[PDB]
Design an enzyme around this catalytic site. Structure first.
Site, PDB file in Angstrom:
ATOM      1  N   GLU A 278      28.020-116.972 -15.448  1.00 11.01           N
ATOM      2  CA  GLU A 278      27.980-118.411 -15.156  1.00 11.01           C
ATOM      3  C   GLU A 278      27.955-119.299 -16.369  1.00 11.01           C
ATOM      4  O   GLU A 278      28.273-120.489 -16.190  1.00 11.01           O
ATOM      5  CB  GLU A 278      26.784-118.702 -14.266  1.00 11.01           C
ATOM      6  CG  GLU A 278      26.853-118.017 -12.918  1.00 11.01           C
ATOM      7  CD  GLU A 278      27.921-118.546 -11.990  1.00 11.01           C
ATOM      8  OE1 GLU A 278      28.620-119.514 -12.316  1.00 11.01           O
ATOM      9  OE2 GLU A 278      28.067-117.917 -10.902  1.00 11.01           O
TER      10      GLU A 278
ATOM     11  N   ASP B 229      32.778-126.557 -11.687  1.00 12.94           N
ATOM     12  CA  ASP B 229      32.874-125.103 -11.665  1.00 12.94           C
ATOM     13  C   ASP B 229      34.317-124.694 -11.375  1.00 12.94           C
ATOM     14  O   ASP B 229      35.247-125.500 -11.314  1.00 12.94           O
ATOM     15  CB  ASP B 229      31.867-124.512 -10.678  1.00 12.94           C
ATOM     16  CG  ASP B 229      32.202-124.639  -9.208  1.00 12.94           C
ATOM     17  OD1 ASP B 229      33.255-125.202  -8.884  1.00 12.94           O
ATOM     18  OD2 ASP B 229      31.424-124.150  -8.378  1.00 12.94           O
TER      19      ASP B 229
HETATM   20 RB   LIG Z   1      30.086-121.496 -14.093  1.00 16.05          RB
HETATM   21 RB   LIG Z   2      27.083-121.463  -8.024  1.00 16.30          RB
END
Ligand SMILES: [Rb+]
Ligand SMILES: [Rb+]
Ligand SMILES: [Cl-]
Ligand SMILES: [Cl-]
Ligand SMILES: [Cl-]
Ligand SMILES: [Cl-]
Ligand SMILES: [Cl-]
Ligand SMILES: [Rb+]
Ligand SMILES: [Rb+]
Ligand SMILES: [Rb+]
Length: 164
Positions: free
Chosen positions: A11, A20
């Site tokens: 992440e 994202d």
């Molecule tokens: Rb990410």
């Molecule tokens: Rb997430």
């Protein structure tokens, strides 16, 4: 390697709101704020999550605070989910991390929908499960991350994350 280190690799860490892989406003270590296209809606979610006036920016300690909440809640939610709990409990602690990773990325309901893969995992048919897991929007849209998670399921080792 452990679940925190694994998800931090997958992440990243960003201290300002960003979009994202799906285009959704996020912050920290993969903390999804909202699917709304309104940055102001995302900023309101953020302030509420942290309990102050952040307008889009947090500290590292704050990011880590949300991240441990999110990991804790993913585990807790797996254990309350009738489809995921038995699979989780049947898996060794390394493979459990792969399941937590999937829930972190795509939510409980989404993972619980992988009915055939979940069965193969509970049967310990690791190469079959790995083949099946890849036949997914998940894999197509984030193939390198999915490959890592799938290797973790297939092998029960950290080979796909050791030295990332
Ligand atoms: Rb990410
Ligand atoms: Rb997430
Ligand atoms: Cl806005
Ligand atoms: Cl939150
Ligand atoms: Cl197999
Ligand atoms: Cl298959
Ligand atoms: Cl990827
Ligand atoms: Rb926007
Ligand atoms: Rb277990
Ligand atoms: Rb299903």
């Amino acid at each position: 390697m452990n679940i925190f280190e694994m998800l931090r690799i997958d992440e990243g860490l960003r201290l300002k709101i960003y979009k994202d892989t799906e285009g959704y406003y996020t912050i920290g270590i993969g903390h999804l704020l909202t699917k709304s296209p309104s940055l102001n809606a995302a900023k309101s979610e953020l302030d509420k999550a942290i309990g102050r006036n952040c307008n889009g920016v947090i500290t590292k300690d704050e990011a880590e605070k949300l991240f441990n909440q999110d990991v804790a809640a993913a585990v807790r939610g797996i254990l309350r989910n009738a489809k995921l709990k038995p699979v989780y409990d049947s898996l060794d602690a390394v493979r459990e991390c792969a399941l937590i990773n999937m829930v972190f990325q795509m939510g409980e309901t989404g993972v619980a929908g992988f009915t055939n893969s979940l069965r193969m995992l509970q049967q310990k048919r690791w190469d079959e499960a790995a083949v099946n897991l890849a036949k997914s929007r998940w894999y197509n849209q984030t193939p390198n991350r999915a490959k890592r998670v799938i290797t973790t399921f297939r092998t029960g080792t950290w080979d796909a994350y050791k030295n990332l």
